[PDB]
Amino acid sequence: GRVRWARALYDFEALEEDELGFRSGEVVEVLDSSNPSWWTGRLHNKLGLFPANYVAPMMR
């Protein structure tokens, strides 16, 4: 498969402006999971980086 989503099981760790923040039980579409920790994605229509360690993808 190909993981490319960010499902937050807990709050968001986005402390920066160039990042993106999600909430508990949320689905996010990742645009670039290439990285060893921080991946660049977007929630709904908001673009920003997120913690790939805090949340995990969702293969649907």
Binding site: E13, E16, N35, W38, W39, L49, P51, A52, N53, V55
Partner: peptide
């Protein structure tokens, strides 16, 4: 508790 470091952001 997942710990993320911003010192490794997409670079």
């Amino acid at each position: 508790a997942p710990s993320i470091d911003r010192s490794t952001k997409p670079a």
